[PDB]
């Protein structure tokens, strides 16, 4: 039970958080590394928001874009 | 100029002004959803824009692919 905040997306999109004190950030560019990541933090049990490019579901395999869907926790947010 | 602008319910948008953010938009009904997001893509001090996801369906299509473009600002919805 802990609602932190995590970030993922490229470099160029986590140093804006990191600077501004977010270190739960995941570094990512390789489509692999996007899934692995959005499933990482749905396997922790400590983050309750995560910010992303709106552009990252797509990539998501439908089960994963389902399971998110719900989204008892963590809220998704999607940059746009 | 890039101001965060938040649209939403009080209760959403409480959570924003105690940390600081004041360009809050109170809405609720349907209608005044369209219009507060009409009016802030009507400005040009705006550079980001964060709403609930549940808001885009409430959009004339026109509007809703009016962002289409979402050049700026970027809008963020939380899900």
């Known amino acids: 039970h802990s609602h932190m905040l995590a970030v993922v997306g490229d470099p ?3 140093i ?3 600077l501004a004190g977010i270190s739960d950030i995941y570094e990512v560019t ?3 590394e996007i899934v692995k990541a959005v499933e ?6 400590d983050v309750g928001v ?3 490019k709106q552009e990252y579901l797509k990539k998501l395999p439908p089960v994963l874009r389902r ?3 719900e989204k008892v926790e963590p809220t998704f947010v999607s940059v746009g």
Do not use: H, N, W, Y
């Open 50 to 52: 995560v910010i992303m």
């Open 67 to 69: 399971e998110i869907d």
């Open 12 to 14: 160029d999109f986590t």
């Open 30 to 32: 390789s489509d692999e």
């Open 16 to 18: 804006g958080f990191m």
């Open 40 to 45: 990482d933090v749905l396997k922790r049990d």
